[PDB]
C-alpha cells in the first residue's frame, strides 16, 4: 500500500503570491494554467515561469515536461517567478486586460530602476511621474507636502550618477510632472509609462555576450523584431540588424551560432557563445519572438 506524495510550490507575480500543491506527474503547462486561472490572465503567450536549477542557474520552466523532472531546486515550497518572457511590439494595441498591463508595468519599471534599460534623464523623470501618479493618484498640495517623494525609489542609479542634481531637485521636477497628470486614472498612468518605456532603445532586448571569429567581444540582442549585433561598449544602437524578413535560417552547433540570409548575395553571420546553454536560450527566444511576430501579421 501507499499514498500520493504531493509537492508544494510557490509562484510569485510582480505583486502577488500563490501557494499550492502539485503531483509527481504534474506538467509545467498544468502549473502555468493554474497560475493564470487564479489571477484571471488571458494574454498568456507573453509569460513563462522562472525557476532556479540545482546549480543556481535561472531557467524558464518547459511547459511540455513534468515540473519535478527539470532539476528545480530543493525547497519545501518550490519557488517560481511568473514573468514576461516576450514583450509586445506595441503595448497600447496588445495589452488589453488590466492585470496584464499592471504586470508588464511592474516588470518594466523594475528593469528600468535596476539600470537594465538606458534612460535619458528627462525621460527618466517623466517615467517616474507616471509611476507616482499610478501609486499616489492625483497630486494634492494639501496632502502631498514637500518631501512626499523622499523615500520613493524614483530614478535609475546611473541617471543619478551622470546628470548631477540634488535629491530634492529631482523630486521637485518629478512632482512638477505629477501635477500635470491631475486627470489620469491609475490604469491610464501605467500605460503612459509603458508607452514611453517601449520606445527606449534597450527596451525589450535580450542581451548576450558573444565573440566573432577574430575574437572581438560583441553583444547579441534578441527582441520582438529580430536580432542585432552591438559593439562591446554600445548596447544602445545596433551596428548590424537582422530583421526577421531578412533571416532565412538560424542554427547553432555547440558554441558556433550561424545566421543565414534570405538574400544569398549577403554573407552568413557567425558568432561564438561561451556555453552551449547560451545558444539554446538565444534560440528559444528567437523562435518565441518570431512566432509572436508572425501571429501579429496574419
Amino acid at each position: 500500500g501507499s499514498m500520493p506524495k504531493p509537492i508544494n510550490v510557490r509562484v510569485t507575480t510582480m505583486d502577488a503570491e500563490l501557494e499550492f500543491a502539485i503531483q509527481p506527474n504534474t506538467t509545467g503547462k498544468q502549473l502555468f494554467d493554474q497560475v493564470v486561472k487564479t489571477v484571471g490572465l488571458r494574454e498568456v503567450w507573453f509569460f513563462g515561469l522562472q525557476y532556479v536549477d540545482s546549480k543556481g542557474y535561472s531557467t524558464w520552466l518547459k511547459l511540455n515536461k513534468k515540473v519535478t523532472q527539470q532539476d528545480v531546486k530543493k525547497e519545501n515550497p518550490l519557488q517560481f517567478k511568473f514573468r514576461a518572457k516576450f514583450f509586445p511590439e506595441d503595448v497600447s494595441e496588445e495589452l488589453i486586460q488590466e492585470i496584464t498591463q499592471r504586470l508588464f508595468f511592474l516588470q518594466v519599471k523594475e528593469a528600468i530602476l535596476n539600470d537594465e534599460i538606458y534612460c535619458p534623464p528627462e525621460t527618466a523623470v517623466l517615467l517616474a511621474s507616471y509611476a507616482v501618479q499610478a501609486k499616489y493618484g492625483d497630486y494634492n498640495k494639501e496632502i502631498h507636502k514637500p518631501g512626499y517623494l523622499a523615500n520613493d525609489r524614483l530614478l535609475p542609479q546611473r541617471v543619478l550618477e551622470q546628470h548631477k542634481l540634488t535629491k530634492e531637485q529631482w523630486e521637485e521636477r518629478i512632482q512638477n510632472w505629477h501635477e500635470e497628470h491631475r486627470g489620469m486614472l491609475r490604469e491610464d498612468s501605467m500605460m503612459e509609462y509603458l508607452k514611453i518605456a517601449q520606445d527606449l532603445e534597450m527596451y525589450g532586448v535580450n542581451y548576450f555576450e558573444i565573440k566573432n571569429k577574430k575574437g572581438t567581444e560583441l553583444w547579441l540582442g534578441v527582441d520582438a523584431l529580430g536580432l542585432n549585433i552591438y559593439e562591446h561598449d554600445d548596447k544602445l544602437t545596433p551596428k548590424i540588424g537582422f530583421p526577421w524578413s531578412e533571416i532565412r535560417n538560424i542554427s547553432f552547433n555547440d558554441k558556433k551560432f550561424v545566421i543565414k540570409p534570405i538574400d544569398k548575395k549577403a554573407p552568413d553571420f557567425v558568432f561564438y557563445a561561451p556555453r552551449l546553454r547560451i545558444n539554446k536560450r538565444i534560440l528559444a527566444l528567437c523562435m518565441g519572438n518570431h512566432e509572436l511576430y508572425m501571429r501579429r501579421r496574419k
Binding site: 532565412r248 538560424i250 542554427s251 547553432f252 528567437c286
Partner: peptide, 7 residues
C-alpha cells in the same frame, strides 16, 4: 549539440 529554425 545542434539545432536549427528555418523561418
Amino acid at each position: 549539440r545542434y539545432e536549427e529554425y528555418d523561418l
